[model samples]
Target chain A: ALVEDNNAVAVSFSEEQEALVLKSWAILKKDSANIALRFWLKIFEVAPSASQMFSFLRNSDVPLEKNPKLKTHAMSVFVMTCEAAAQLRKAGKVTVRDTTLKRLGATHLKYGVGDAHFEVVKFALLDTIKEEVPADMWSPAMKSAWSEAYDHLVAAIKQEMKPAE
Target chain B: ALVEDNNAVAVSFSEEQEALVLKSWAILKKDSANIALRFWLKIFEVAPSASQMFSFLRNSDVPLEKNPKLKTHAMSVFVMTCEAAAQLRKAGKVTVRDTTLKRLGATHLKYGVGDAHFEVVKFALLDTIKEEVPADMWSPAMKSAWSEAYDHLVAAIKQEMKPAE
Candidate 1:
């Protein structure tokens, strides 16, 4: 299982994990726009059908980098995910607005997102981070930290989905 | 100054304050969409020129409730602000991605936003919360908690602005 349980149990990160995330994130921030673009592209490449989930990608002749709306949406999601991960330790949990959570759940449901889709995205995110963070600095612990953080967010998002299905 | 210093100082809330915020937020979440719309309307009413800052509001004859773009944007901001406030204690700070922070700062600057504009937003937010929360449950402490949470977020956003001007 990506997460041990689907329940929204609170998750906490170690100080060391937080440090690792923040430090790597600082480097990632320098080229965040490009990183966000690459991250999305990786997801599309891994799961070609995933591109169908995005309206902006539908019937669009524009290249990914040239699509302003796609860029904006991708950057927002990427930044939000990273920011939530960075604060996971201090916050003791993923913090999201209730209304925002509901909206995301509904949107994801409409887009036919499921555990498999989430798994693909997780793979894409970790692979992207691994490529971005220098090999010397990367470690299993760091990967575990990002995985736990991502799982917590997915858990929270899934909470709103339970009632629907 | 809305906040004592514009520097991004860490802010923590007391246990009681956190309880106050989360409890009230649980109630607010039930009717979040309406509250979000009301909050934005209050801002526009208090500061008519504030509407100029939003592109969706420009040359649009549609009523506020009928404008999907306006509703989506307003709801997102309102939820983000409230969620951050609710988690202020546990998080020990406002959590935002560096890229997101930079984007907000630039957007606000382009819209000619200033301290006065923030002050107006604060006023509107507090007033909206007061009206939403029952009189029996509301208190000066609740108001103070929300104000502090909002200020911390503003401080973080302003951090990116310092270098621009």
Candidate 2:
């Protein structure tokens, strides 16, 4: 249901976007272990410099894929993504989740995640999804839905990161 | 595949427990808006004192049941509960979700939530589920499973709250 608007335009996500992302998630979540592990591998493969940001990833004798900390971290982010997709629908919806997003943004800032870091991470995520999802299941519509979800979330984080001054 | 352990202490959830709770969740999640709204209403109705803990709940001109912020907070918590139930399965699975528990515990502490507060909130939640879920769907096994999950979470949060000393 669209809210009444006088002049300002409201950003709205269609029910299709919500359903498409969720349908893809149903399959992806089944393989969360792979999703998390492969995502990190792709991030490091494409942007080796980004590795230093994660302390667990930085100085571990264990293989990157075998790191328990990495597993936990991966599951955490992926789970959050799933939960966010279930929640982040309309524009007003974002403000409701601001407390969570702000905490996430602050944590990333403390870890020294610059604006550019997000771009590289986003690239890695898309690539990982491409590799995991079967050919027939992967569609332009699916990609667009996930991309919009990511863009919405990233924008929220960036807004939280901006200086008060 | 079950993990092999020599003289390993037992750790397994019953299929009955898993099925009943999950069945109930499927029904509840179908209407997240209702689940979110009614959950808060039940909380305040049963434990009026608990309402003050939520900033939005504490100060709202609109009735608590109609408050959009209340809806947001409820959905966020309910969604996390769903995710936790999904990933917090398998013996020793609770540890996998420690990060989220620690964050939740820390947030509660900031909001002046104490040991007793958890019990009240848990009671309200169980009562809410009872009201929302069909009578036939309710069972001792369902209660036990939800209790186990809730207790596991609260214990982790309590541990996080304990002083290092």
Model 1, residue A49: displacement in angstroms?
A: 1.0
Task: Please give the fraction of native interface contacts (Cα pairs under 8 Å between A and B) kept by each candidate.
Answer: 0.00, 0.00
In order, what are the TM-scores of chain A for the candidates? 0.83, 0.79
Looking at model 1 chain A, report the run of 10 residues with the lowest lDDT sum.
A1-10
**CA RMSD (A), model 2:** 22.5
Local distance difference test, each candidate: 0.71, 0.63
* lDDT of model 2, residue B146: 74
How would you encode candidate 2's per-residue C-alpha lDDT over A15-55 as one tens digit per residue?
77778777777777788877887888766643444664554
Query: Which window of 10 residues has the lowest lDDT sum in candidate 2 chain B?
Result: B1-10
- The regions of model 2 sitting more than 4 angstroms off are A1-9, A56-62, A90-92, B1-165
| Cα lDDT tens digits for candidate 2, B18-129 | 6766788778878877776767765554334467665543444555546566677666555555544554455534453557767876887887765445654565567677
What is the DockQ for all candidates, taken in turn? Answer: 0.01, 0.01
Docking class of 1: incorrect
How does model 2 score on DockQ? Answer: 0.01
TM-score of predicted structure 2: 0.44
